[model samples]
Structures are given as structure tokens and as C-alpha cells.
Target: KITARILYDRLKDSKGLYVFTDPSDASLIDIQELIAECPFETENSTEWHVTVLYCKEEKLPDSIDVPEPKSLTARAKELTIWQDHKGRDICVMLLDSPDLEAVNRKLVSQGLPHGHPEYNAHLTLAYQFENNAAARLFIEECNQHLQNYPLFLTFDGLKATRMM
Candidate 1:
């Protein structure tokens, strides 16, 4: 199962449609290796993605209808760790994505909350690595061995995936 499938296992996840970012074929292996071999035993493994559009907490049970799922693109900006409202931390690759921001704007029109204020575009490398300190160190090591920055990524699979 992929990250989205495993995400459903967590009890408090909002049940809704969110677009997941899958690196394009050209950089698939290159991007995958950058993340898959991370020095951490994490919850989300095997399939990696930057969730391009996620509804924030407290906006539960909203926005199942959306623009059709289609391909979109973005470039790698940087890597950092984000603390989720749920208390888990994420090793994230930030993205420069106006396309995703437009999508977020569309989702907002349909009554869904933006993933974060100002539409933060990010791809998750790993998350919930035991605790915050471990998660932060994951970021540092990934940074030291990071591949070149400004890597191109095209995120797809935009359909609403229901999790319950």
C-alpha cells in the first residue's frame, strides 16, 4: 500500500479527497532514492509523495467535489521538517508550485480548508520517526546527502480518494 493507504490507518485523519504528488518517470528513481533510503524507521515507506492538497484539521467532512484529477508540475525548493497539528512531524521537501496553489484555490471555493495557510506546497520524505528530535535529525542527514536542488516534479492522481 502507498502513503495515502497507510494514512487511512490513523484514526483521526480527515476523510476527504486530496491530490497526492508522485514524482514523474524521468526522476522517479532519483527522487525515490533521495527519500527511500532515509536513515529512519518511519511509518510511511515504499511509496513516497508530497501531498499537494490536504484539508487542514477542523475542516472535517468537506469538499468531495473538485476539478478533475490531472497532471501538474512543480520544482524542488528545499527540505525541512513540519510539525503536524496531529503531533507527528514530517520530513518535507518544499516545492515552488503555482499550479498547486491554483488547485488549492479551487478546493477552497468548494469549501475545503487549505493544507496550510498560504498554500504551502511540500512533498513528504518521511514522517513520525518516533519523536521530534529524531525527525529533525532526519532532515539534517537528508540535507547533507541531498541531490541537486530545483529538481523538477510533476504531481498527479488528483481524484478524491475516500478513506474510512
Candidate 2:
């Protein structure tokens, strides 16, 4: 089973804001409010990460209008899930992106917030397990049902969301 200690040792998370996408629609969401609600100190406390753009908390403007949902693609390379210190099971969607660095730099140049030092493009699927064993078991089960490699996700855009 994956434990918080184990996962934290392997993966590091960044503190940034991003758009929330519904799997079915998977894109075309606003970024302003999403960023406003995504930080640890904010009122919203759910932990999930499917991001398009990354920014800082204090630097975020009231709203940024995403004209339309832009098509985006990222490769899901790993099927591991993470258990946080808070006992939350975060489905680790290890994604690789070629455009992420460029995008982040552009945003920062435009006076927007920058991404985390360990910025990774991923999706926080759920927090259902209570322990490391439960998280590990679920990952094993999911691996059996999903692809082995080159997992790809296609989406329309990013939006802000709250964890429930």
C-alpha cells in the first residue's frame, strides 16, 4: 500500500493555482475563481490537481477570462496514487508536458504568479482511502484495469474547482 510517507519521499507537490475540469467535458473552465479557491490557507480545502496554467495566490487577479476551451494534451506516465499526511488518497496522474515550462514562464513575464518549484501537471482523482494499504490496494486494482504506459488525457481547458 502507498503511504503518505512513501509517496512524499518520491513525489513533491507545488503550490500553484489552476483550472478545474470535469472529466466528461475535461476543459473549458475559468481560472480566476479557481485560483482564488485552490490554496491551502483558502476556505476551499479539497485536494485535487488538473491544471492548465499555474499562478501564485497573492498575484492572482479577480478573474481571467478564458475565451474558449483550448485543446490540451498531456501524457500520463504512471499509475501511482499518493496518500497525504492528512490521510487523503490522491490518485497520482504523473503527467509530462512539453509546453508547461514555456507557459509558466509566459505567465510570470506577464506579471502573473509562477508555479511551484516542483511543478507537475496532474489530476487529483479522489481521497477515499484511510490508510496506506487501502491506497496501495486501489492502485493495484486500477493498474489491472488501465493501460500500462503512454496514458494520454485530452481536454478542452482548465477551470478552478473545490475538493469535496
Q: Which candidate ranks first by lDDT, i.e. highest?
A: 1
lDDT tens digits, residues 34-60, model 1?
A: 666456664343455556456654545
Off by over 4 Å in 2: 1-17, 20-49, 63-70, 85-87, 128-135, 141-149, 160-164
Instruction: List lDDT for all candidates, in order.
Output: 0.60, 0.46
Q: How many collisions between residues are there in candidate 2?
A: 7
Model 2 clashing residue pairs (backbone): 19-159, 20-159, 20-160, 27-157, 28-157, 34-160, 56-113
> Model 2 residue 10 lDDT?
20
- Model 1 residue 36 CA deviation (Å) reads 6.2
Off by over 4 Å in 1: 1-12, 42-46, 55-71, 85-87, 130-149
Task: Report the C-alpha lDDT of model 2 over 28-54, residue by residue, as the tens digit.
Answer: 132112223221222122333456555
